[PDB]
Symmetry: C3
Subunit: 335 residues, 3 copies
Amino acid sequence: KLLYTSANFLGIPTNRGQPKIGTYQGPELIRKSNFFQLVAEDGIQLTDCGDIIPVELNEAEDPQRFGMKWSRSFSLTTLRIAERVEELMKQSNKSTPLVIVGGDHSMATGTILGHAEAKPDLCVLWIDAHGDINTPLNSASGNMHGMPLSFLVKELQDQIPWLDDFEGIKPCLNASNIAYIGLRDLDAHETHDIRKHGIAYFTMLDVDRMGIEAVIKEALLAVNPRLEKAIHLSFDIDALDPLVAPSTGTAVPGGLTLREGLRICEEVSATGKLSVVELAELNPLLGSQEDVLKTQSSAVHILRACLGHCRSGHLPFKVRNLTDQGIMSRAAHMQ
Amino acid sequence: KLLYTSANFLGIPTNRGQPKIGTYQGPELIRKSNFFQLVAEDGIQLTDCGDIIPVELNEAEDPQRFGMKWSRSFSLTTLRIAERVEELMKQSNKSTPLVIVGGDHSMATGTILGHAEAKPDLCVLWIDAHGDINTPLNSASGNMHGMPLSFLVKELQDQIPWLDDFEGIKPCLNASNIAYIGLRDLDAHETHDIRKHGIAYFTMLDVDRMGIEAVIKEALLAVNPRLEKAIHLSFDIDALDPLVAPSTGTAVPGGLTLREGLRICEEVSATGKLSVVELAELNPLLGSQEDVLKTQSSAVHILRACLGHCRSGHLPFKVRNLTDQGIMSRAAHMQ
Amino acid sequence: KLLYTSANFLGIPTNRGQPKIGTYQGPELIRKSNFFQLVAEDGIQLTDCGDIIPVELNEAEDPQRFGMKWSRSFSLTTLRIAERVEELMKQSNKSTPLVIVGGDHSMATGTILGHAEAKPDLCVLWIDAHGDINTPLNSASGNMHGMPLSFLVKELQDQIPWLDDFEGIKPCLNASNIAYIGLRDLDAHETHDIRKHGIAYFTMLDVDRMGIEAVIKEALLAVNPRLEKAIHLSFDIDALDPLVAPSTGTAVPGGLTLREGLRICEEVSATGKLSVVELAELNPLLGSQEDVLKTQSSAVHILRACLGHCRSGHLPFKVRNLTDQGIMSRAAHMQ
Ligand SMILES: N[C@](CCCC[B-](O)(O)O)(CCN1CCCCC1)C(=O)O
Ligand SMILES: N[C@](CCCC[B-](O)(O)O)(CCN1CCCCC1)C(=O)O
Ligand SMILES: N[C@](CCCC[B-](O)(O)O)(CCN1CCCCC1)C(=O)O
Ligand SMILES: [Mn+2]
Ligand SMILES: [Mn+2]
Ligand SMILES: [Mn+2]
Ligand SMILES: [Mn+2]
Ligand SMILES: [Mn+2]
Ligand SMILES: [Mn+2]
């Protein structure tokens, strides 16, 4: 009756991928919610595997290199994440999805690296207002959370500066293994690289013209045609409209409705191939108390959909009967 | 020019169907609005028939029975509502719609009972995030507003515990006479009963995949194929997204847009078969002042659509002419 | 690579078309934003042409005439606007769009008058919750911002009272040159005139049933079939849902989503025929600080779309290369 009967939960409180303090509280925002209770109510055994501890160096240890901010904290954290995800995914070999809560999106380099170590032929569905595929010299901001895919994509490696501490970060993705949904604020050089190397992408313009149902279908068609590959679903909460997810660092108006977001996750879940889902860029320190509650709520509904929650309802495990308790029913009484 | 030239208005301030104080202020929230003025401006004669006084017993008189909270207050209130609705609907036999403002949704047992007494072959369109069809032993909450349909549906009576004071509450609905729109938070046993007895239902997943236009059509097709039956439209305000109706007790993210809600009401109205519309679960004591204003506004637009308001405009009753006032026009002056 | 490489920007702080103080701050709300910076980042040369100074008479000089409030301030302002727009549009003869920020919508009589002087065969796309086509004796409010089209439409001139100071305001539009999108709160006499004279209109009901893609297509088909005519896009910010544009004087629930608004502007822009776009009814003195920020944001995204911003991204003018800086890439290092 369930596609996934077990799941693992991992927190990754990354906060050195971008300058706004608070993404480190992301995992706790979800733990404080009713997520676990709701998942159990659906019959799923969810194991909290704790948090990864990011490496956070001081300024002296981690100066700017090629404009990148905290790049050694990044490289060390990436390797620590990858090791943990790899070992979690290998104990998993009905499959057992890994649910990851961030943390800023710089964590994705590590999670995908480790995931691909366990499952080399995976595909990536990237749900985001942003491309997150800036190579270091093209990044105006120097924020690592805008670069995580660039280190992973083989076709881009002539645009990545060599750093010794980045050697263990091996490019494990082909451009043909990635599909974007939700884009609406690409940098020019991202647009260039995406089009040049033929990365499948469906922006909010595409969602408007095609509808989310067709977009989801085409995205899966592009990178997982016959559902042969494990899916890495990388969900940036800022893919959703700021009206439903205001508490995040780089919000952009005109996003996915919660319903559109749910449809993406419902379809990905229903493939039976959801291997890892990560939810990035929750920041409970941004916005009002009600803003945080809305963002939390949206996140929980999204993550539930990923694990197979159905808005059309679930059947009970044991159907209750009235006579079993020795109780007279109205139907019984009338006869 | 008008499908309905007259209408009746009834308040039912039920608040013993659920524990949050404030649904009793629902009718006043609408009376305080510009609803009446706007309805008159469309040429409709709307008569305020006052409020039904719910029976509210004290704890000693109304202890828990079969887990139900305030079940004798419920049974007595149900009978009082039914008597009033029946007499209102029988004076009505262009038909004259009855507009009912709640009050929590437990009132629906009474309104439908009385309605069916006047019009036995009616159908029910239930617009709600919830099923409201829990039988008493399956209800974790014991809140009557989550059970009103269960006492009315004939196929469910082997699951209703017999109570003497419930005898006058006769099941008057076949499962085939009900269609849901907007569901997104069903209890497992509700899901079971709905599927088992073939109740037509269109959840938010269905709305996403089909679109609201097709959903409305299919819902009417399922329970009123040739528009032969009077329609009881039971509209829970929490069917709408919390962004447009935050002031309600059990809000669930990812609801109908106001526009989707308007389309439901516009189509139901246009059948010429709208016999009763009830609007449930307004709670002006929940949320901020602006939250209440939004919910009020959404409710007024919804109720106006039910009575035939057209967003594409109405024609004037008397067309004004310039020369009638003895005034020189620009066209006149240029000649 | 760009449809429009240059554009002009004009502020018109009209505030005598309606009684709520604050629309005069509209132009500054946009100047304070990052609009100019973002437009430049797309490669467009935008020239700020300053503000038009409206004529604002005192009460003694400008008493009510035919129920109209501030009608001489209106007639004088209209002529001053028209002169300025005409001279701006004639210096413009890749064309150079004129972007106008209001100001209440009464400015439209002046902007269209001047525009048509430069381009007599123009068409008008009116994006609004309201018709703004009340003739003076039918207007209950007397607010000029609800009448600007009535003075321009030739077919309506037998319903316009003659005033000497209105002589220079010559009707320059045929009813067949106008198409509405977004209507949802028409006055009865507006509905009458619109239907009587066959003005193309697509209300929110039409948007719901047809979808915005079809609506845009049909609107352009109705008034600009072969893209032969210059387009005057008159965008009332209250066309958008109050959830995304709360800071405006006459907000009506159930409006266009920001995305739907963007699609309108994206398609109009892509015709290559966008000649003038005006954005009306911004009022930074209404609503909360966050309300103003949302409205500002929505306005900037809308105006950017008009000038050709693409949500699917732009290509860089110069593609950056790694070796040009004398830097070793990862690809280089591995060989
Ligand atoms: N691409 C940006 C944003 C990165 C956000 C990372 B995410 O998706 O985890 O929140 C810069 C975006 N860009 C900035 C200026 C104007 C256009 C968009 C960057 O800093 O590289
Ligand atoms: N079905 C619920 C909600 C009833 C709401 C009545 B309405 O539609 O008038 O507002 C309980 C819902 N349920 C609770 C736990 C998790 C799943 C949903 C119940 O209490 O029976
Ligand atoms: N049509 C109205 C609104 C004008 C708004 C001008 B805009 O689009 O620049 O904001 C009156 C609307 N009308 C009022 C009563 C009920 C129905 C709608 C008027 O005052 O003429
Ligand atoms: Mn992002
Ligand atoms: Mn991201
Ligand atoms: Mn409900
Ligand atoms: Mn209900
Ligand atoms: Mn308007
Ligand atoms: Mn207007």
